[PDB]
Write a protein that binds this ligand. Structure first.
Ligand SMILES: N[C@@H](Cc1c[nH]c2c(Br)cc(Br)cc12)C(=O)O
Ligand SMILES: N[C@@H](Cc1c[nH]c2c(Br)cc(Br)cc12)C(=O)O
Ligand SMILES: [Fe+3]
Ligand SMILES: [Fe+3]
Ligand SMILES: [Fe+3]
Ligand SMILES: [Fe+3]
Ligand SMILES: [Fe+3]
Lengths: 236, 244
């Protein structure tokens, strides 16, 4: 059992199962119009800005002298910028519609977006008392699940971007390329964990992908319940 | 000291923090009847970053319907009442003229504004603090949170009831009825403070209880500071209630 080969293999095993979820088969289906495949886009509003705060305030610790924490801090500086990309594509896709303040509040805190809204909350609770090397396991599992989601979402996104000649930033290949280079993974490959640390790392990987699966399930149920609320992008 | 005396100190510490919390300048502003009540409730939209997070805190973080600990069952009952008040907030939001029409992204940018950081993360910090606590320690979190909340809504009810009387409208969040519900407890349930009064704490429990009380009131103080800075930065965005 060399080093953290078992933990990294567990992440790869969870990733292959996560990739086969029915919501991703729907998003990758080029026989369906990309505007209908991005019906789930407004659901990300309950996550994208919570993810910003997760990287700003929960992962990050600008006062610590730990070298592993400083590498985490640099990693969070990049991920904390992507919320503006979400709001950019929100307007481009025609989902930045006008509404009452309370209607926006009821949408974000809707019971149908519970798992989406509480994903970053659960991650922060899990990672509050972890040592920096254990925080990296949380981040690495989170980055792996996110790359799966945006590798699929970029397919209808780039189709709309090309057809409308607009520059998309969130559901786009440029977002995927930044996430692909997400070094934390090099430290994990060279880190030896104790028996207690390895058991905790397995729990981390299981919880992250279980919570991510719950979020994807909410995305699929939203598409079924809002099958007519397709994206409405404009051409340039 | 004695286990009953170590707990007595914690409950006295909550009262000591409450007396200091009551003297914050934001509360002197809200209680000043020489200032228009519409201007004293300028801070009301700031509560949008808290009220619905507080609902989820009571729904999912405090509550645990699978445990057989009777203290946990009393916590669950207590959270069922507090988890209903978010609808009162949205009720008064519309009455005060703060439920304005806007872009979806503009509502998102408001809730996650950096000027509402401490307001938005208060329930988050409470949930992180209360995740691994035993039920009796969770009651200390709840009791401190309820004490700080009562201070805030005792003050907010003064301009709220003035507007309710002048406009003949039924307010539910910034109203005396909200304060009375928080002061009273559910029928047939045992008071949380009474259970705490009869609880003997260990030396380790007293150390955690002091940290809990200090953190809850410090985070509440940070939220109030954001409310005061918001009023100064948005002095013209007064409430606009309508009459009957
Ligand atoms: N690239 C994502 C980060 C991310 C990381 N993990 C994610 C999961 Br699981 C679901 C969703 Br929706 C997003 C993510 C972002 O910038 O918001
Ligand atoms: N009675 C409040 C609960 C509450 C409890 N503690 C609070 C603090 Br500290 C700040 C604010 Br704003 C609200 C609260 C409510 O129903 O939302
Ligand atoms: Fe990203
Ligand atoms: Fe990333
Ligand atoms: Fe309340
Ligand atoms: Fe209460
Ligand atoms: Fe109470």
């Amino acid at each position: 059992s060399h080093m953290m080969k078992a933990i990294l293999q567990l992440i790869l095993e969870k990733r292959q199962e996560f990739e086969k979820l029915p919501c991703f088969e729907f998003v990758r289906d080029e026989t369906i119009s990309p505007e209908e495949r991005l019906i789930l886009y407004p659901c990300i509003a309950a996550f994208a800005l919570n993810f910003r705060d997760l990287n700003r305030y929960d992962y990050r610790d600008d006062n610590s002298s730990d070298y592993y924490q400083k590498i985490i801090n640099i990693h969070t500086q990049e991920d904390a910028k992507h919320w503006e990309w979400f709001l950019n594509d929100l307007e481009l896709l025609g989902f930045d519609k006008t509404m009452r303040f309370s209607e926006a509040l009821r949408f974000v805190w809707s019971d149908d977006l519970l798992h989406t809204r509480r994903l970053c909350h659960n991650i922060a609770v899990l990672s509050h008392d972890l040592e920096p090397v254990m925080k990296m396991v949380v981040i690495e599992a989170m980055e792996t699940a996110g790359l799966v989601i945006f590798h699929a979402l970029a397919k209808p996104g780039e189709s709309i971007a090309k057809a409308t000649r607009r520059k998309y930033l969130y559901v786009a290949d440029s977002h995927v390329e930044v996430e692909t280079g997400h070094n934390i993974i090099t430290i994990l490959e060279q880190t030896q964990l104790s028996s207690e640390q390895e058991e905790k790392a397995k729990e981390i990987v299981n919880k992250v992908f279980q919570w991510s699966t719950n979020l994807i399930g909410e995305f699929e149920r939203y598409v079924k319940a809002h099958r007519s609320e397709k994206a409405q992008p404009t051409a340039a």
